C-alpha cells in the first residue's frame, strides 16, 4: 500500500493495520 498504520490507520482501501505498515491481502504494497 505505501502507507503506514503507525497510528493504527489506513486510507488505502483493502489494506489492513499491520504496525507500523498498512498491508494489503497479505502483503505490505
Same mark, same amino acid.
Given at each position: 500500500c505505501g502507507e #503506514?498504520?503507525?497510528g493504527? #490507520?489506513?486510507n #488505502?482501501?483493502?489494506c489492513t493495520c499491520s504496525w507500523?505498515?498498512?498491508t494489503?491481502?497479505?502483503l505490505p504494497v
Open positions: #503506514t498504520c503507525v493504527g #490507520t489506513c #488505502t482501501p483493502g507500523p505498515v498498512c494489503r491481502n497479505g
